[PDB]
Amino acid sequence: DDWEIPDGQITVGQRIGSGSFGTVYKGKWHGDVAVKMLNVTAPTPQQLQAFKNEVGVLRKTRHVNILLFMGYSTKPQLAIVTQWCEGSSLYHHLHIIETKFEMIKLIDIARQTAQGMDYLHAKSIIHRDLKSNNIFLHEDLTVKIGDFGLSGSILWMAPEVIRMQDKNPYSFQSDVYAFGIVLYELMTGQLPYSNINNRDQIIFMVGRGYLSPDLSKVRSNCPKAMKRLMAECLKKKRDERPLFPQILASIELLARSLPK
Amino acid sequence: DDWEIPDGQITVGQRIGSGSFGTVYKGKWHGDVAVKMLNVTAPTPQQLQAFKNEVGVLRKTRHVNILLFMGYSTKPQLAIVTQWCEGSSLYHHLHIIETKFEMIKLIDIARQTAQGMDYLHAKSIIHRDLKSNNIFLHEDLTVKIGDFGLATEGSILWMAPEVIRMQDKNPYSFQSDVYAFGIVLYELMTGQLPYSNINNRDQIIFMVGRGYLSPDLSKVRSNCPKAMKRLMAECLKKKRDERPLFPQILASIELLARSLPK
Numbered sequence: 001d002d003w004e005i006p007d008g009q010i011t012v013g014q015r016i017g018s019g020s021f022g023t024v025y026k027g028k029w030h031g032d033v034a035v036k037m038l039n040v041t042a043p044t045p046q047q048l049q050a051f052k053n054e055v056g057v058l059r060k061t062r063h064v065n066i067l068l069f070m071g072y073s074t075k076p077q078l079a080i081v082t083q084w085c086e087g088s089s090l091y092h093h094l095h096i097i098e099t100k101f102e103m104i105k106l107i108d109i110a111r112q113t114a115q116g117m118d119y120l121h122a123k124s125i126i127h128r129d130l131k132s133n134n135i136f137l138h139e140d141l142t143v144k145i146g147d148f149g150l151s152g153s154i155l156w157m158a159p160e161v162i163r164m165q166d167k168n169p170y171s172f173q174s175d176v177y178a179f180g181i182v183l184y185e186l187m188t189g190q191l192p193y194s195n196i197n198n199r200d201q202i203i204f205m206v207g208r209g210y211l212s213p214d215l216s217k218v219r220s221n222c223p224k225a226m227k228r229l230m231a232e233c234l235k236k237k238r239d240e241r242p243l244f245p246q247i248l249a250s251i252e253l254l255a256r257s258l259p260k
Numbered sequence: 261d262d263w264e265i266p267d268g269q270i271t272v273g274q275r276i277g278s279g280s281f282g283t284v285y286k287g288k289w290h291g292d293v294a295v296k297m298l299n300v301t302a303p304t305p306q307q308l309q310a311f312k313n314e315v316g317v318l319r320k321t322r323h324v325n326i327l328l329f330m331g332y333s334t335k336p337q338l339a340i341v342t343q344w345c346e347g348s349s350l351y352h353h354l355h356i357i358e359t360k361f362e363m364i365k366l367i368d369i370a371r372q373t374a375q376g377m378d379y380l381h382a383k384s385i386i387h388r389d390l391k392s393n394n395i396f397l398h399e400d401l402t403v404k405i406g407d408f409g410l411a412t413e414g415s416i417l418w419m420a421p422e423v424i425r426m427q428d429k430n431p432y433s434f435q436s437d438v439y440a441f442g443i444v445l446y447e448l449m450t451g452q453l454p455y456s457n458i459n460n461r462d463q464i465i466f467m468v469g470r471g472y473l474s475p476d477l478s479k480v481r482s483n484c485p486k487a488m489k490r491l492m493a494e495c496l497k498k499k500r501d502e503r504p505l506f507p508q509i510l511a512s513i514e515l516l517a518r519s520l521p522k
C-alpha cells in the first residue's frame with residue numbers, strides 16, 4: 001500500500017550526488033535505482049511530517065518525462081528512491097562531454113522537456129529549480145525531469161527571482177525563464193555569460209537588468225520560430241512570458257515542419 | 261490529486277486493438293498516451309466501485325518494467341490511461357513481424373520481464389494473465405508489462421496445468437505466473453509458439469491439463485545458454501510447488517548474464 005520501502009531492501013552502492021541539499025547514490029531495489037540520502041539523521045517529528053508532505057507531491061506525479069518516483073524510506077535514515085537513468089544529464093552531454101546533437105534531436109529534447117514541465121504545471125507543481133543539470137536523457141532519447149521535490153546555479157534564475165522583490169517570486173513564469181535558458185543551452189551549445197569569470201556580477205547584472213543572454217549565438221540552423229520562442233521565454237517581464245500550453249504548441253508546430 | 265481525468269481532456273486517436281473488457285486507442289493527453297475504453301457502458305454503482313478498486317491496485321505500482329499507469333476516467337465512459345509505447349508487443353515482434361533478436365537481447369528481454377514480475381509479486385499482485393502479448397517492448401529495449409487490472413475478473417498457451425484443470429476455486433498463484441513466464445521464455449528461445457505441430461486446441465488444452473503434452477524444449481536455438489535452458493525447465497515444472505519464485509529467477513539470470521558479454 002504505502003510508499004515507504006521497509007528497512008533494508010535498498011542496497012546503497014556507488015556514490016554520485018554532490019553538495020548537501022541531499023547526497024545521491026546508485027542503488028538496488030527490484031533492479032537498479034538512484035537514492036537521495038537527505039542525510040538529516042534523527043528527525044525530529046515533525047520534520048518527518050514536512051518531509052512526508054514533500055513526498056505527497058512526488059506521488060502526485062505519473063508521467064514519462066518526469067523522473068519516476070518509486071518510493072521513500074525513513075528507517076536507515078531519510079531518503080528518496082527513483083528509477084536509475086542509463087545515460088547522462090543534458091548538462092553533462094552539452095557542457096562536459098560536448099555531444100554534437102542533431103538539430104532535430106535538439107528540438108526534440110526541448111519538446112520533451114516542454115512536455116514534462118507542462119504536465120507539472122497541470123498538477124500545479126512549480127519546479128523552482130529546472131536546469132540542464134536536472135534533465136537526464138535516459139538511454140539518449142527519453143528526457144526525464146527530476147530534482148523538483150522539496151545557490152551556485154543562478155544562470156537559470158529569472159531576474160524576478162534573483163532580485164528578491166517579495167516572499168514568492170517563483171511562478172510558472174519563473175519556470176518558463178529557466179526553461180528558456182536550457183533552450184538557449186540547446187541552441188548555442190554553451191552557457192549564458194560564458195565570458196564572465198565573476199558570479200556576483202552576473203547576479204547583480206541580471207538582477208538589475210544590465211546583463212541579458214547573448215542571442216546572436218543561436219547558430220544559423222536553429223529555426224526562426226525556435227529562436228523567437230527563446231526570445232519569448234526569456235522576456236524579463238514575466239507577464240510577457242508564454243506558459244507551456246502555448247510553449248508546447250509553438251514547438252510541435254515546427255516539429256511537423258522538419259522531420260524533413 | 262485524484263487520478264480522475266475530466267472528460268474532454270483526452271483526445272482519442274487510432275483504435276489499436278481489444279483487450280480484457282475494453283478497446284484500446286492511441287491517444288493525446290499531455291502528449292501521447294494509451295487508452296483502454298472499458299466498454300461496459302455506464303455502470304451500475306457499484307461496479308463504479310469495482311473499477312475504483314482495480315485502479316487502486318494499479319496506482320500501487322511504480323516501476324520501469326511496469327507499463328506506466330497514468331490515470332482513469334469514469335466520466336465520459338470508463339477508461340484506463342497509461343503511457344504510449346513506440347515499439348511493438350513481444351508477441352508481435354516474435355510471431356508476426358518475425359524480428360531476429362540476438363541472444364543477448366533475448367536474455368535481456370527475459371531479465372527485464374522477470375524484473376517487473378518480481379516487483380508485482382513484491383507487491384502481492386498476481387498477473388493471472390502473463391503472455392508475450394502483454395509484455396511490450398518499448399523503443400525496442402525496455403520491457404513494460406501491461407494488462408493486469410481487472411483480471412480477477414482467450415489464451416491458454418501460457419496457462420499452467422493447475423489452472424487448465426479447474427480443480428479448485430483458485431489455481432492462480434505466483435507459480436502460475438512463473439509458468440506463463442516459462443512460456444514466453446520458450447517463445448524467446450525458439451521464436452515458436454509451443455505445440456506449433458498440433459492443429460487442435462481442445463487437444464492441446466486437454467493434454468497439458470493432465471501433462472501428457474508439454475513444451476518441446478529440445479527446440480531451443482543452438483546457443484541458448486545451458487543455464488537458460490535449465491531455467492526454462494524449472495519454470496515449466498508441472499508440479500506447481502517445484503517452480504522457482506522471481507527473486508530466485510532473477511538470481512539465476514543475472515548470473516548467466518555476467519558469465520557472457522565478453
Ligand SMILES: CCCS(=O)(=O)Nc1ccc(F)c(NC(=O)Nc2cc(NCCO)ncn2)c1F
Pocket residue numbers: 017024025033034035036058066067068069080081082083084085086087088089136145146147148149150
Ligand atoms: C521525481 C524525482 C523526485 S525529486 O526529489 O524531485 N528528485 C530526486 C529524488 C531522488 C533521486 F535519487 C534523484 N535523482 C538524482 O538526483 N539523480 C539521478 C541520476 C540518475 N542517473 C545518473 C546517470 O546519468 N538516475 C536517477 N536519478 C532525484 F532527481
Ligand SMILES: CCCS(=O)(=O)Nc1ccc(F)c(NC(=O)Nc2cc(NCCO)ncn2)c1F
Pocket residue numbers: 276279284285294295296318326327328329340341342343344345346347348349396405406407408409410
Ligand atoms: C498498466 C496497468 C493497467 S492495465 O489495465 O493492466 N493495462 C492497460 C491499460 C490501458 C492501456 F492503454 C494498455 N495498453 C495496451 O493494451 N497497449 C499499449 C500499446 C502501446 N503501443 C504498442 C502498439 O505498437 N502502448 C501502450 N499501451 C494496457 F495494457
